[PDB]
């Protein structure tokens, strides 16, 4: 949605390796990166800040596959998966590489129980 890329980036993980030069942090184990409605899931995420320059951070996620989610302004969610997620904050886009797939959802429903017909219904008409 509008404003997502102005939101703070939040990362949750099982383990966190801080490179001692302070410009690289490596996350592993059920990593969840969120920025507004954007959400990335990966087994491994590396965040690099080349040269200590703020705003130029690069977020790389790896999984089998890693997943991506975002709500759009039009109300339709976008979902994707790939072996690698590459998100440069300075840029306005994410890059999905290796078995990359992306989709848009136009309808959904939640509940405690849901039935769904795996055969197509037939037209019911009689003259």
């Amino acid at each position: 949605v509008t404003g997502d890329t102005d939101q703070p980036i939040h990362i949750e993980s099982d383990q966190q390796s801080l490179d001692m030069q302070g410009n690289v942090v490596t996350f592993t184990g059920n990593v969840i990166v969120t920025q507004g409605t954007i959400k990335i899931n990966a087994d491994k995420v590396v965040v690099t800040r080349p040269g200590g320059e703020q705003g130029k951070e690069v977020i790389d996620g790896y999984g089998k596959p890693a997943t991506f989610y975002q709500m759009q302004d039009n109300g339709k969610p976008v979902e994707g998966h790939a072996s690698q997620m590459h998100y440069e904050l300075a840029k306005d886009f994410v890059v999905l590489t290796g078995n990359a797939y992306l989709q848009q959802v136009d309808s959904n429903i939640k509940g405690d129980k849901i039935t769904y017909l795996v055969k197509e219904q037939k037209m019911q008409a009689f003259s």
């Binding site: 102005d6 993980s13 059920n30 800040r49 703020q54 705003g55």
Partner: peptide
């Protein structure tokens, strides 16, 4: 546009720190 805070948290301790 402007740089955004990057905050990561430890799932075992609940502690967070700004990168």
């Amino acid at each position: 546009k402007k740089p955004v805070p990057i905050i990561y948290c430890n799932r075992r301790t609940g502690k967070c720190q700004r990168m």
